[model samples]
Target: GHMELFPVELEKDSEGLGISIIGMGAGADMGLEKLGIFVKTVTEGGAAHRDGRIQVNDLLVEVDGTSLVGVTQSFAASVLRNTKGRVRFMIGRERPGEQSEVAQLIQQTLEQE
Candidate 1:
């Protein structure tokens, strides 16, 4: 199978990290995004690292079913930053000449063991 590039939502924290922004966005097809989901980072030992579900190169298409393409990154971030709650999204992996594989992003509290 080919590598899957899942779409993820992220935010730029005041701390200079592109923390995963949790929320939903309207899909590329102009449909509603799912809710209460997020993806993991590619590395380990961080808030969203090594979770196996989320990917790093994913594009965020919406917030709570609304499209974010016209919105600036900063503005979309503001919405995600203020809400420490659940949201949904429409996510997928796109391959060359292939139909997208759909999946959901779920959020979990950060924990270290």
Candidate 2:
């Protein structure tokens, strides 16, 4: 399995991280992403969307180098909401051969962690 990294630094003054995510259930079709939570949507004008780094269908593999693999959706949401200051992420881009249209937008962003 191949992987890529995407480092995101959100402003400390932002209202929130502004991203919606979902957990990968048992035997979930994670597309090309790693086994973890997948980004469902990024709020416009929010920290994540404003940063323009994260996007829908991109997998959130880790936070500050700590793997979120096997974590639940509730836990993932809490982690994202609770995180403050500069945050880093290991994002897994969907494979080009994947069928989802959103997967086509997959592109490496920011500096690697």
Candidate 3:
């Protein structure tokens, strides 16, 4: 009975969804993972792609009923990696929005605030 908040059942053969993500595990931060953890891409024929509930631009807010969004990136990836079998992930779907380049600078400062 939910809409924007998606509950996707993605089965995996390996560790986790081989999906492209932002703001968590990458070494350098060029405003990449800055805003939040976003699912940048879904692996073809992989878990998320096979599930078909996920979109490329979904927000990865939490998994297994735990909040990854509020936790450290280290912790976010940690829990997600170790999870297994008939897993259900709850992520936020993409909302509509876009901006001019001036807004980009705002993010740099706001993150520091």
Candidate 4:
């Protein structure tokens, strides 16, 4: 599978983003983050859910105007919690079934003519 970068936008509500992020290794105690942060869940009827774009397991590459790939989970929480107004998300998604990559390339080439 290959990694994909996609954009999603949300307006902050009373309950805020309503997105739950989870990551391992980098914590208050751990110095190194094992795999960075990812979208664990999106609360129902919340900003993120109302927009209906974010998905569980989608890696958060950037939020608002900052990078979050290597930041501490605590810091990440602060960013999400403090952010207000319209929020922009740059998500990294790794999809499966790449075996068709070759066929796709050939198909694209043939269709170009």
Instruction: Count residue pairs with overlapping backbones in model 4.
Output: 0
TM-score of each: 0.39, 0.64, 0.58, 0.67
Off by over 4 Å in 1: 1-45, 92-94, 97-113
Weakest ten-residue segment in model 2 by summed lDDT: 27-36
Model 3 residue runs over 4 Å out of place are: 1-3, 14-16, 24-35, 70-73, 96-113
User: Taking the candidates one at a time, how many backbone clashes does each contain?
Assistant: 16, 0, 1, 0
Q: What is the Å distance of residue 11 in model 1 from its true position?
A: 15
Using TM-score, give the best candidate's number. Answer: 4
lDDT, residue 103, candidate 4: 50
In the range 24-102, model 2's lDDT, one tens digit per residue, is 6465446433346788788886767766777776777777746776477887777766665677777876545444446
Give the Cα lDDT of each candidate. 0.43, 0.67, 0.63, 0.71
User: What residue pairs clash in candidate 4, if any at all?
Assistant: none
Q: What are the root-mean-square deviations of the candidates from the true structure over C-alphas?
A: 15.9, 11.3, 9.2, 7.4
What's the lDDT for candidate 1? 0.43
lDDT of 2 at 85: 67
| Minimal lDDT window, size 10, model 1 | 32-41
Which of 2 and 3 is ahead in lDDT? 2
Residue-wise lDDT of candidate 3 within 1-113, one digit each (tens)?
22266777777756556677666344345433434566767888677787765568776677876665444555656777677666677777546344444555445664655
